[PDB]
Amino acid sequence: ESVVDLRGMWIGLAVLNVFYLIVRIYEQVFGWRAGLDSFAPEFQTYWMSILWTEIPLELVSGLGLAGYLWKTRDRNVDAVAPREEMRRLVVLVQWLVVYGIAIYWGASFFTEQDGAWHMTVIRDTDFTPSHIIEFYMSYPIYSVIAVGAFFYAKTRIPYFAHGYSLAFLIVAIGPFMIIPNVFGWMALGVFGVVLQILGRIHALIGKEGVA
């Protein structure tokens, strides 16, 4: 045993961060001489190929990940040893870190990236290379990852099972309320989520003069 692992995290982090880097290099190259005129055949082969492909892949990956965490759920969750709970909830915190990164790329990088592209074209279509990446890839991805985080918590930690964390809810569902054109109700309930984890870390030790 080791309560702290982290391999899973680094795998998810390298696989996610290289992927986006490939996507950014891909748009630097095929942004020009492929993505400026959506009427051209190059738009079909280089841009719509991504869109038509990613939507189903993300939808299958979403349902496939939920379905898997559920089938493999802990049917004996109330029986979990203090140590194994401590491990399961370090894994939650792993999920949430990957989701932190996912949210950065999706909501910061690729969203404001759309800002500069709006000043580049006059738009043939709703599906600009910017949007294809931002709305149809970048956002679904952290949406999926968020649902995973939630599902993992519901199926492995007694607390997140029998309940629905209201804060975790807002986190998993909030994304499905992002819509642009054409103040404040946002996802930021990770605040609640980490307080519930801390609530739970606190309780997994009675002899805490050591901190």
Q: What are the residues binding Zn ion (CB under 5 A)?
A: 162
| Segment 143 to 202, residues that bind other proteins, using CB under 8 A | 163-167, 169-170, 173, 176-180, 182-184, 186-192, 194-196, 198-199, 201-202
79 binds, among Zn ion, other proteins, none (CB under 5 to 8 A by kind): none
The verdict on 12 binding other proteins (CB under 8 A) reads no
Relative orientation angle of helices 166-173 and 190-203, to the nearest 10 degrees: 140
Non-local CB neighbours of 141 within 8 Å, separated by 6+ positions: 16, 58, 102, 105, 106
Residue 93, interface with other proteins (CB under 8 A)?
A: yes
Cβ closest to Zn ion, residue 162 vs residue 202: 162
- Is the Cβ–Cβ distance between 155 and 74 less than 8 Å? yes
Shortest CB 82 distance to other proteins, Å: 4
Out of 15, 26, 28, 157, point to the residue binding other proteins (CB under 8 A). Answer: 28
Tell whether residue 76 is a contact of other proteins (CB under 8 A). Answer: no
162 is in an annotated binding site: yes
Question: Distance (Å, rounded) from C-alpha 91 to C-alpha 154?
Answer: 13
Phi-psi domain of 171 (left: phi exceeds 0; alpha: psi -120 through 50; beta: other): alpha
Q: Is the peptide bond before 194 cis (omega within 30 degrees of 0)?
A: no
Residue 164: name its binding partner from other proteins, Zn ion, none (Cβ under 5 to 8 Å by kind).
Answer: other proteins
**Judged by CB under 8 A, which stretch of 21-29, 44-52, 58-66, 67-75 contacts other proteins?**
21-29
Which two tokens mark 157?
A: 């930690």
Residue pair 55/136 in contact by the 8 Å Cβ criterion: yes
Please enumerate, by residue number, every residue annotated as part of a binding site for Zn(2+): 78, 114, 118, 131, 162
